[PDB]
Amino acid sequence: MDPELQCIRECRLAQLKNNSGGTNGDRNSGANNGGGENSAPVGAAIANFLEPQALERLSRVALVRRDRAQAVETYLKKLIATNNVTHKITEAEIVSILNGIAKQQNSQNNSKIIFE
Ligand SMILES: *SCC1=CC(C)(C)N(O)C1(C)C
Ligand SMILES: *SCC1=CC(C)(C)N(O)C1(C)C
Description:
By secondary structure, the chain is mainly alpha-helical. It has one domain (1-106): PDCD5, DNA-binding domain (Helicase, Ruva Protein, domain 3), CATH 1.10.8.140. It has helices spanning 3-15, 44-47, 52-82, 91-104. It starts with a helix and ends in a 12-residue tail after the last helix. Bound molecules: ligand MTN (2 copies). One copy of the ligand *SCC1=CC(C)(C)N(O)C1(C)C binds at residues 7, 10-11, 73.
């Protein structure tokens, strides 16, 4: 329970020991080993659960209201992590949930602020 702490722990582990060269911002993929033989499910499996065109939608709104976009991705994660899942999110699905999230909301914003 309370996966709030475990969440940061997941990214914290990745933030430890890195490299990838770096140097300002310019490198955006190209040639790097990862999977190879066999399949490749893992998180990559959820990346396909989002249509290509729909992928742009969540990206577009996020640039304006990441708070709502954050809940949309969380909705699918719960479905995929649980089992309820049974459909590939779409531009309408993202918007549909986003529209429903704005109705329920939570209490306030407090977004991109806990970043410490
Ligand atoms: S809880 C913070 C968080 C959630 C998820 C979308 C899995 N992430 O990549 C971060 C670690 C930012
Ligand atoms: S920990 C950073 C991170 C993990 C993952 C869930 C793959 N993400 O989308 C970000 C880049 C936020």
